[PDB]
Amino acid sequence: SPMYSIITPNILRLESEETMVLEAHDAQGDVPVTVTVHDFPGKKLVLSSEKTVLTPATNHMGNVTFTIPANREFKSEKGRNKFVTVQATFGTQVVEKVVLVSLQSGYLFIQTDKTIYTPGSTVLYRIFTVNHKLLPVGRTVMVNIENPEGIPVKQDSLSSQNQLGVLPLSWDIPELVNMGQWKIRAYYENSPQQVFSTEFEVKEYVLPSFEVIVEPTEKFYYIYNEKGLEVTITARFLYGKKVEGTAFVIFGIQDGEQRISLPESLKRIPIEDGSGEVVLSRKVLLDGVQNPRAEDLVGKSLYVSATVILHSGSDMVQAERSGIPIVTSPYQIHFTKTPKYFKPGMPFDLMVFVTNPDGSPAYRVPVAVQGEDTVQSLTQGDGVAKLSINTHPSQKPLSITVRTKKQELSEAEQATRTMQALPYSTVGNSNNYLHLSVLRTELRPGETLNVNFLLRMDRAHEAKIRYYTYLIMNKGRLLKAGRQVREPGQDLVVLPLSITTDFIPSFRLVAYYTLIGASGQREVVADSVWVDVKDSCVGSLVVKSGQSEDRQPVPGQQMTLKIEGDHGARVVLVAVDKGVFVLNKKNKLTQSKIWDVVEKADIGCTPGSGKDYAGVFSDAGLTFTSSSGQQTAQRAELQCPQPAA
């Protein structure tokens, strides 16, 4: 008989849309499908809507949607796991599966007008309330303001319905206050365990009139450098003119969370032409430490503290550069974007993520496989290099070691990393695989991407493969799915995929085929891959000057603010002196941190592939269950398993 199949994500979310993808395999004629969601454990029936008919004109496909409500009965358990049950009845044959549920319902982002405030001043703050799709939602938010030792002093409750997801609010700081770090915490009413937070500082200050930049030549220190670490000083007024003064600068060492200061590292340099330069030599650093070994210095970090005063002597700025690593290697190699599962006897692609010692991506550094010097490649803009091997059918794990080949640098300076990949397990060791391959570029919305599907099986069963089934996972929900048909002899087929703004910042593609092979046994073989998308806005808000002349306008002058942006959008504004940010630039919100928060909320844990077809879906973040019996592995943990590191 035909086999019925249901595909859904691993984890379902409250107060948001959830995609449900229904398919029948090898089916004949129409088959009606009714859909039901029950609770777990027991039966109280939470959703009984939706039905559809799988049609051979549609290749027995049918995608239907639903939404999970939450009430006082759902929100009851807040600390431990709870589950629900999805029911779909294909004609007379029912297929059902228990699903893990997350209690999260969206995102909260908090903007403050300043990052640091005075006693007796006003704090202006806007809370943006969005769902999981980063679209404005109208819900009730509970916000609290806490003291340095954690005492809530002011709390609010308000709904953003019909306000386009914006809650503008205000509060006045009393003069009776304890200076230090103050915290704003917020959570939705229907998700009290998901707590968002951002911080600010309270201090007694006046703004400075200039900024001081401390610039290391390299953002690391190589221990055997006889010259030592060079740190360039740049100082200029806030309106952009050069600062004349004298700087006092001192160095120090950070080991873990504890900082150690080097007292004799103090120097005194004049700041001329808006600049200065100071060098901490290798002898002074080794004289500062009481351990004469250079080997124990590896793994710790340095910090610089500077104090600059103008030659008028009327103002003073203290700046700090910190977290500068003491390392043997100017690069860090990671297999973080490489799958740990190879296909035996089929070539395998390696995506090598190389960074600078601080963590910033390295640009145009050549790396090579340890085996054979001929296979070399340079990193792209995002710090990713493309390597590949021609795999043998070894059922033994394959160790992969990658080492950089950048010129002039010694072998002690060449970084390296060693991992061990694992073989794909076919059903019954049939050696019938699916291999995916794709371009590796920075993806912008509007480009097309060629997806390549390679079939490997004996030719007696190649005529039974008439289609592929693909799905797209993006931001923890199914965005698109469908069939790609195949005629016999076409082991490779190509599917163009157009990139839209919905695919930002990263997405996973899964694909599979199915048949009855070997001795009359149902076989499922799958494959997956993770693709990075260039981080950008879904829309495009730009702020520029309306005037084209009268550079540096007069205080109080009228000027035209020109705002280009998407039609129908609501924009919020704040204009801040940069001298606030020279005092404290921490906790500034940006679009890149927004996509970083979404990537930290991703339910997929691996850059593709897997130990089997079930491991492919489970690592991608998907659940599968068939009427014949083949289904995904059970998952009862929301978080991803931690690597050994």
Ligand X SMILES: *[C@@H]1O[C@H](CO)[C@@H](O[C@@H]2O[C@H](CO)[C@@H](O)[C@H](O)[C@H]2NC(C)=O)[C@H](O)[C@H]1NC(C)=O
Q: Which residues bind ligand X (CB under 6 A)?
A: 63, 148-149, 178-179, 480-481
Contact yes or no for 34/86 (Cβ under 8 A): no
Minimal distance in Å, beta carbon 635 to ligand X? 23
Minimal distance in Å, beta carbon 426 to ligand X? 28
Minimal distance in Å, beta carbon 299 to ligand X? 28
Minimal distance in Å, beta carbon 201 to ligand X? 13
User: What SS3 state is found at 248?
Assistant: strand
Q: Which is nearer to ligand X, 63 or 431 (CB)?
A: 63
Minimal distance in Å, beta carbon 551 to ligand X? 46
Residues 576, 578, 583, 587: is their CA dihedral positive or negative? positive
Minimal distance in Å, beta carbon 448 to ligand X? 17
- 322-341 burial string, b = 16+ CB within 10 Å, else e? eebbbbbbbbbbebebbbbb
Q: Which is nearer to ligand X, 149 or 372 (CB)?
A: 149
Q: Which is nearer to ligand X, 91 or 148 (CB)?
A: 148
DSSP string, 481-537: EEEEE--TT--EEEEEEE--GGG-SEEEEEEEEEEEETTTEEEEEEEEEEEEB----
State the Cα–Cα distance between residues 617 and 610, nearest whole angstrom: 8
Q: Which is nearer to ligand X, 19 or 160 (CB)?
A: 19
Minimal distance in Å, beta carbon 19 to ligand X? 7
Termini Cα distance of the chain: 47
Q: Which is nearer to ligand X, 448 or 642 (CB)?
A: 448
Q: Which is nearer to ligand X, 179 or 563 (CB)?
A: 179
376 burial (CB, 10 Å; 0-12 / 13-18 / 19+) is middle
Minimal distance in Å, beta carbon 584 to ligand X? 17
What are the beta bridge partners of residue 637?
A: none
CA atoms within 13 A on the CB side of 152: 8
User: Quick check: bond before 366 cis, omega within 30?
Assistant: no
Cα angle 14, 20, 24 (rounded to 5 degrees) comes to: 160
User: What SS3 state is found at 293?
Assistant: coil
SS3 for 333-351 is: EECCCCCCEECCCCCEEEE
Minimal distance in Å, beta carbon 178 to ligand X? 4
244 burial (CB, 10 Å; 0-12 / 13-18 / 19+) is middle
Q: Which is nearer to ligand X, 118 or 416 (CB)?
A: 118
Residue 109: both structure tokens together: 């982002």
Q: Which is nearer to ligand X, 470 or 595 (CB)?
A: 470
Backbone phi, psi, residue 494, to 5°: -120, 135
384: left (phi over 0), alpha (psi -120 to 50) or beta: beta
Q: Which is nearer to ligand X, 153 or 179 (CB)?
A: 179
Q: Which is nearer to ligand X, 202 or 385 (CB)?
A: 202
State the Cα–Cα distance between residues 367 and 395, nearest whole angstrom: 27
Minimal distance in Å, beta carbon 476 to ligand X? 16
Q: Which is nearer to ligand X, 375 or 481 (CB)?
A: 481
Q: Which is nearer to ligand X, 435 or 480 (CB)?
A: 480
Minimal distance in Å, beta carbon 319 to ligand X? 23
Residue 23: Cβ within 10 Å count: 26
Maximum pairwise Cα distance, the chain: 91
Backbone phi, psi, residue 429, to 5°: 50, 45
Minimal distance in Å, beta carbon 474 to ligand X? 12
**Which of 249, 248, 245, 250 has its CA nearest to residue 271?**
245
CA distances in angstroms from 516 to 1, 29, 255, 394, 466, listed in the order given: 11, 20, 60, 26, 13
Q: Which is nearer to ligand X, 150 or 240 (CB)?
A: 150
State the Cα–Cα distance between residues 99 and 84, nearest whole angstrom: 6
Minimal distance in Å, beta carbon 64 to ligand X? 8
